Amino acid sequence: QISVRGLAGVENVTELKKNFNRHLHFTLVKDRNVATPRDYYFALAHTVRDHLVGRWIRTQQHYYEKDPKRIYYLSLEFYMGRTLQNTMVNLALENACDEATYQLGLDMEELEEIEEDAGLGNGGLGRLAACFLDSMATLGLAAYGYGIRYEFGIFNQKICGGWQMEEADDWLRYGNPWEKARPEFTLPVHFYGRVEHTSQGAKWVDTQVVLAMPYDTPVPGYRNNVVNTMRLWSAKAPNDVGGYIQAVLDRNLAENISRVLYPNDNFFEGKELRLKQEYFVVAATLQDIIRRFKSSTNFDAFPDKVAIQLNDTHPSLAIPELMRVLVDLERLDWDKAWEVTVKTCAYTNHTVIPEALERWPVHLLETLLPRHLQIIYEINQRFLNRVAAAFPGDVDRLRRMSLVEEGAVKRINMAHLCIAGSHAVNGVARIHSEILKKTIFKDFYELEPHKFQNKTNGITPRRWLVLCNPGLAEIIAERIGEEYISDLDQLRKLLSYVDDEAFIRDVAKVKQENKLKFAAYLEREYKVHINPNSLFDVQVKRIHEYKRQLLNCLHVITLYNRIKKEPNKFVVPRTVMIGGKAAPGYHMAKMIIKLITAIGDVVNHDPVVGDRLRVIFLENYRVSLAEKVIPAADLSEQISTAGTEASGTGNMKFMLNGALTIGTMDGANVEMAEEAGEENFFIFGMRVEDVDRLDQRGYNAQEYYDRIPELRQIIEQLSSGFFSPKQPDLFKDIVNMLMHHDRFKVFADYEEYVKCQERVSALYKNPREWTRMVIRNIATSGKFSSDRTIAQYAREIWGVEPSRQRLPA
Amino acid sequence: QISVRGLAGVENVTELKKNFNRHLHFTLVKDRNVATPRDYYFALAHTVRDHLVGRWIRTQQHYYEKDPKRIYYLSLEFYMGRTLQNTMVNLALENACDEATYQLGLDMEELEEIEEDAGLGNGGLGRLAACFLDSMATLGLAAYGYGIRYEFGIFNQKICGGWQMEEADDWLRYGNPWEKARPEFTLPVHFYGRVEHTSQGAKWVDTQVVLAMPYDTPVPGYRNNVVNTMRLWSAKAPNDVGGYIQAVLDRNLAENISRVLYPNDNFFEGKELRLKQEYFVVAATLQDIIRRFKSSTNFDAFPDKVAIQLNDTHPSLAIPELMRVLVDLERLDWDKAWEVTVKTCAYTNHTVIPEALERWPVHLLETLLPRHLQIIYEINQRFLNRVAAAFPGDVDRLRRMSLVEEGAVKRINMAHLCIAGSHAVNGVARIHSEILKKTIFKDFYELEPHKFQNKTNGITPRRWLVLCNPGLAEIIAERIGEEYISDLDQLRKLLSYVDDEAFIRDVAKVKQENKLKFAAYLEREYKVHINPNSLFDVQVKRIHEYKRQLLNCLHVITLYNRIKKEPNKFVVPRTVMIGGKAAPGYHMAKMIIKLITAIGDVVNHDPVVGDRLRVIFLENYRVSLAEKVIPAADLSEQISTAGTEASGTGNMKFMLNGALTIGTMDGANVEMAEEAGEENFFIFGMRVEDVDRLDQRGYNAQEYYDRIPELRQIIEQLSSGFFSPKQPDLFKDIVNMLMHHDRFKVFADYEEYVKCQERVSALYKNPREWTRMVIRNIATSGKFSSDRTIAQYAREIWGVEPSRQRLPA
Ligand SMILES: O=C(NC(=O)c1ccc([N+](=O)[O-])cc1)N[C@@H]1O[C@H](CO)[C@@H](O)[C@H](O)[C@H]1O
Ligand SMILES: O=C(NC(=O)c1ccc([N+](=O)[O-])cc1)N[C@@H]1O[C@H](CO)[C@@H](O)[C@H](O)[C@H]1O
Ligand SMILES: O=C(NC(=O)c1ccc([N+](=O)[O-])cc1)N[C@@H]1O[C@H](CO)[C@@H](O)[C@H](O)[C@H]1O
Ligand SMILES: O=C(NC(=O)c1ccc([N+](=O)[O-])cc1)N[C@@H]1O[C@H](CO)[C@@H](O)[C@H](O)[C@H]1O
Numbered sequence A, B: 001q002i003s004v005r006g007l008a009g010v011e012n013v014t015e016l017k018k019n020f021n022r023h024l025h026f027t028l029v030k031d032r033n034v035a036t037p038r039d040y041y042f043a044l045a046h047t048v049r050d051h052l053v054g055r056w057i058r059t060q061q062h063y064y065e066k067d068p069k070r071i072y073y074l075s076l077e078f079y080m081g082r083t084l085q086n087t088m089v090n091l092a093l094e095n096a097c098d099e100a101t102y103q104l105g106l107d108m109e110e111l112e113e114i115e116e117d118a119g120l121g122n123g124g125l126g127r128l129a130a131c132f133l134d135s136m137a138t139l140g141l142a143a144y145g146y147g148i149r150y151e152f153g154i155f156n157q158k159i160c161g162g163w164q165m166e167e168a169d170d171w172l173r174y175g176n177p178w179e180k181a182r183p184e185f186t187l188p189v190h191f192y193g194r195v196e197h198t199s200q201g202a203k204w205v206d207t208q209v210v211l212a213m214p215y216d217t218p219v220p221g222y223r224n225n226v227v228n229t230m231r232l233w234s235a236k237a238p239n240d241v242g243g244y245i246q247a248v249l250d251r252n253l254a255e256n257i258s259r260v261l262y263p264n265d266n267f268f269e270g271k272e273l274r275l276k277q278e279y280f281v282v283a284a285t286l287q288d289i290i291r292r293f294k295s296s297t298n299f300d301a302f303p304d305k306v307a308i309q310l311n312d313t314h315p316s317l318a319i320p321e322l323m324r325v326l327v328d329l330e331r332l333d334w335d336k337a338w339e340v341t342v343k344t345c346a347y348t349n350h351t352v353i354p355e356a357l358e359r360w361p362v363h364l365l366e367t368l369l370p371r372h373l374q375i376i377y378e379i380n381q382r383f384l385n386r387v388a389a390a391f392p393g394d395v396d397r398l399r400r401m402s403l404v405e406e407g408a409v410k411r412i413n414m415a416h417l418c419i420a421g422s423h424a425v426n427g428v429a430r431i432h433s434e435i436l437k438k439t440i441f442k443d444f445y446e447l448e449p450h451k452f453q454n455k456t457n458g459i460t461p462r463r464w465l466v467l468c469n470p471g472l473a474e475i476i477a478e479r480i481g482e483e484y485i486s487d488l489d490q491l492r493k494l495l496s497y498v499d500d501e502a503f504i505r506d507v508a509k510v511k512q513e514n515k516l517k518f519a520a521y522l523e524r525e526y527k528v529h530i531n532p533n534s535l536f537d538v539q540v541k542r543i544h545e546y547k548r549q550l551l552n553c554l555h556v557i558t559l560y561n562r563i564k565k566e567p568n569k570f571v572v573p574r575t576v577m578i579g580g581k582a583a584p585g586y587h588m589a590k591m592i593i594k595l596i597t598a599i600g601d602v603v604n605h606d607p608v609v610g611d612r613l614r615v616i617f618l619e620n621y622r623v624s625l626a627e628k629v630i631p632a633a634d635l636s637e638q639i640s641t642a643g644t645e646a647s648g649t650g651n652m653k654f655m656l657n658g659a660l661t662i663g664t665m666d667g668a669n670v671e672m673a674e675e676a677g678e679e680n681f682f683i684f685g686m687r688v689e690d691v692d693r694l695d696q697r698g699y700n701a702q703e704y705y706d707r708i709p710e711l712r713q714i715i716e717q718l719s720s721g722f723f724s725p726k727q728p729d730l731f732k733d734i735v736n737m738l739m740h741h742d743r744f745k746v747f748a749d750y751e752e753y754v755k756c757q758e759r760v761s762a763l764y765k766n767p768r769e770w771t772r773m774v775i776r777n778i779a780t781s782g783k784f785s786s787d788r789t790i791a792q793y794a795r796e797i798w799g800v801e802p803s804r805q806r807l808p809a
């Protein structure tokens, strides 16, 4: 139907249909009379999976023959989403499968909705790992993603009585057709025990053993026939009546390590189970890496054949674990082992907020990983000796830079460990990387300037454009070809169409179709109609005070009060959509969700408002839902307090899909505005410097409350129970926080935000000009392709060259 | 190679080879360069499994169209063993697969050893269920086996320092290619809660819910194209940070229900988890049965379309559960519901030993299944009213027959419940069924004579002859054809070959080859040589005092002492093999295993003995091992105290495979001797009547110790530490038991046993006559085919006619 979805040749369609029927029969043990919708999805999944096999075997065989430098991306999160459509897209089988299933009397889009999301992540950090895997495969890098096969991913969110309820995400219930267990690579992981110092080196003994069984998932590159691997480890107890029965049941204790993903993305919690997960993935991965290295013994060449990227400090134990193996098992001298370690490891930081940084209590490491604690102390001693030599007499610096933090309970600062043991440390956006050098990592930057780099984030154009918005991808391709899908910078060619009446009309048509499509979805799976002609104002991302969904809420209430004040005045119709999950123990975040639904309960049922304003909370925001809502958005809300959002990636997804952005000069927003031109962006609020000035003199929210009548009215409504009749003081915690302890200065940006929003409404009233600005945004979103990001990591950190050359078959 | 293994046609072999390579590639994601032995096994398993699909779909479709009466065999145990070879045997693909794998350069027998046994049973009771499924499929009955999919079956047994060590049987670790999950049939099971009596009937509320997810395994009939189903239920928690994390981890509690098989086959233990397993299988199965019944509402015809067979009392809750559904949910009147229940249920008893009978504490049922306890009390009240009317004034009878036992803690006697709620109750051997009527069930027999029946056990000739002993099956087929494989009575035709010199020579040759084959296996997988020319004296079965492995031990020691007494006298060489697992908490059974190994440690290293006597303990006895050792045995030890072994089935396996039997007139041994002729059996010991006479006057072991010098010597050796130098009093518990509290009268049968064993040795010295007696045993083993047993259950209990007619394809 659509050319960017590939060819639907007769022989290919015929083959697909027969293999589909073959799997339904032999694999599913069903015939068209008793087959359930799920049976059909699995038959299709197997049929597509079959096309990956040859390429997967050939790719791995290829790496063995050429023996390239291998890239290992270690992450505790891989927010993959669904795999079926993405696989068809990268293999150019979408149209063929669509035709094949059509001929069999089935709707492929209906079958795609049956697949469960692989939600093995919380948000941005986990999704970045996913986009990176896609880009690394597309760029021909011998890359491996290593993580944990959680049997329960991020919880499914249910909204009950306006409150978030958490439900277990049993995503493996019906099976996962994409994974392949590799029992021959099962490896032992050690815990607890003690250290013995003998004549020849230290020895870690009396440990408890847990087995790590790997499951491999294929990662197909975009039409280059490359299929890389994502290997996830699953925990298994070693095999060696009340007592007997209990012993068997207690096996669950050991296997609980890979049971569930920790959902706290706001505050670090030093929980033992989480520490076990972190060591579990690191220990099994490093053994696998070393095995592959030896199967390709001087470790001097180890850094030339191995690159380990640490996604945040979560897998930071890789540093002392590599030292342990090299010193304790391989018997290399410390200095040489350290040289190898630093040269193979690199660390990526994702936030500057204190509460999110990992600082593990010493007593916990002491009990669980005694040898690693000793190695960490030794690393610290040698590092601090270097600091003392470079800054003689600077005693305060020694205290600040130590990997060991003193006080109540001694803790190990994992970020400091990562910097000391990595040859490269990077931020994820220009402004973020600069802040790292000026604030939290200043001392380290002064000691080792060369280590600090910037690698602005990106998103894959395949899942975030071709897959979720084929209509837009097609009108772009009709004019500039398909080459931009793997070379996004080519979108700049669209700048010469900004005045093309035909193109302007098509861009607007695609957006309208997406909105109608989403407006429908809303009614089918949920229960409310929305004016498809209203401006779709969307803010989707995890709920956090720093992301300021609260500021958005203040604007919504302002709009509502203005309508009530002058009912018969014309106002641009809006459908405000807010969605995202809140970490289970994050009280304020859960109160914000309740506030949003409470506002909707009032606004959506006010006769005077009509369909000029609607407030909808998008339930269970996840990758699959993002693929639906983003293409339908008109306005992207990226309003974090300047200096708090390291980069953001949702912002890039919206820009690539035809939405204009209203935001602060924070994270990647700065670079997006720079690429598109500030006149094509809706920028407002305090800049980082402004926030600093306010902190210097002290932030007093009362001042804003006293000087802004509209803000005062809103606060009084919240306090008096206007949005919670039956529970008058329901939102007292929110008002108290805003008035006395708001770390994110919501009131400080209120006035500029409301004024900026008025300018957005003004532009929406002029369809043609709104669309021309949209075109200017899409045309300059090329820099934000994760292919660009990965190419920079490859050349500037890993020391490998990207390849666009395809492979046999 | 061997005609009884089917044809190896060119087209069939060619097809098998290509499908094997197809699975290795697409299913295993491997090529002949990195494929592991396990990869090859799975490729073969999938290839064979593919041939089952069409027949499986057609069979179930067939039952829907014809809507025959369905037979439901409920069991907490299904001791299946391996599936690959059995499937090839029943589909006549053995030779073809053998040739196909051969051409690919692989040894099929080597690949078969990779499959894990499905050890979902303890012994005889669980294996009977397995043979029954095979026979029901072979006889064309619309039969379903229902049970639990334990993720851990019977423990693997390790012998350390002569002691049994238990190891978890993680049989699903590498996956099970034979099963197919059926998520569309997931059903809820209720626990705890309370009963509410409203205007219209009782209601069970506030219950905890656990989901039952079924997994189906195909059960192929012998070359009749019928493929029945064995459906096993797996427990799943319903889907609805410390608290959040713990809530997810606590899901294991609910899922623990299907985690492990209880290994106590000696003493009943009222454990809550076991009760949960029993209700879990019954609740899910009955809902499935009713669904299928409605999908084919007067339940008057329910008994005409449904038959439920209870394997022991383990699934006895089916009786009150069926009443619950009919009365509480379907709203039928009690009397009508009871009529339906009795007419559809039948109960099979497997032992008369008190300690093995299920007697659940009332307080346990009260908490876990409140409604069922109420239903049970009502059943009891109505039943006892019938008893009172039939035997007016007999107050003691009312106490004896009650389903409720008074005393320390009130308990529900499940056997009494089963008799009251079943239209048929059967023993498993003629002598056992008679004892039931004369002793433990006498009162019930007097009230309802028509309910009591006998159904002598049997074994399937396919796994127990064709599969494990192809050599013997072939020489038999060469002379009488292949028809006997599904009509075992035809073996009688062999009686006309007892004087055939050619046949006599072939029977002896086959046995010699099997012994050499097993003698080798012993050295390869274990570490000792054995004289292939010695008489193979074998006793394999679970370790129990009533089975008297101890009596066997006394004979071994006697033989050893006699050799030591007169070293230079000729004695027929023997290799005594004893094997079997002991229930984890069965102290005496574990001491018997230690004694056996201790005896071996002395006998096997005595220079004077040489290779005239060897004592070997066969480690990890299981179905797979039985298929190897039984065909190699010369002498089968079936020496339980008369009146204790209900039937025994291992005895039948040995008879069918060319071993002579030494045993007591117990269980099926009586019928085996009757079929073959007492002169062709080595019978010894007290008969049931003799044991009764001894109990009347009182058993005094001292009397035997004082009158038998050889026995006295043995006891003194055990007591003085002759078999445990470092631990002089190691076997004091055994000596104390034998001398003061032996419920099984080991000493009472000692003299006759030793004398009988001498006659066995005398016959072994005459090869030709030994073989002629063997032929007479094999020729009359036909009655012991489970096909005969099932045909009797079908006609006399279930009310259905067996069919030997094959099906399409
Ligand atoms: O577990 C399975 N069992 C069988 O396919 C099967 C087929 C035939 C027979 N048989 O007895 O003929 C038994 C099991 N199949 C599984 O069904 C899942 C859901 O579609 C797929 O994702 C898995 O890759 C597939 O192996
Ligand atoms: O998602 C993030 N972090 C987490 O999910 C997370 C996970 C665990 C913990 N923890 O404390 O355990 C804290 C945060 N960080 C996000 O990573 C994105 C990719 O670079 C950035 O663009 C965002 O600005 C950043 O907030
Ligand atoms: O889990 C499996 N995954 C795959 O076969 C597979 C194949 C190809 C790709 N792929 O990405 O191309 C991914 C997974 N296969 C499983 O391997 C087991 C052991 O042989 C079999 O018993 C199961 O029936 C089969 O489904
Ligand atoms: O195997 C048996 N019993 C058990 O495995 C068993 C299971 C559970 C409990 N329990 O108390 O829970 C007791 C015995 N019984 C055996 O069932 C065979 C088949 O009819 C008979 O031939 C044997 O004589 C009988 O001992």
Ligand SMILES: *Cc1c(COP(=O)(O)O)cnc(C)c1O
Pocket: A122, A123, A124, A127, A540, A541, A542, A621, A622, A623, A626, A647, A648, A649, A650, A651, A653
């Ligand atoms: C892209 C994405 C994110 C990150 O969004 P930000 O606004 O950068 O925080 C989070 N969740 C999902 C499901 C995503 O697709």
Ligand SMILES: *Cc1c(COP(=O)(O)O)cnc(C)c1O
Pocket: B122, B123, B124, B127, B540, B541, B542, B621, B622, B623, B626, B647, B648, B649, B650, B651, B653
């Ligand atoms: C046949 C069999 C049994 C039963 O043996 P008996 O001697 O009747 O107790 C037990 N275990 C296995 C593995 C069997 O094959």
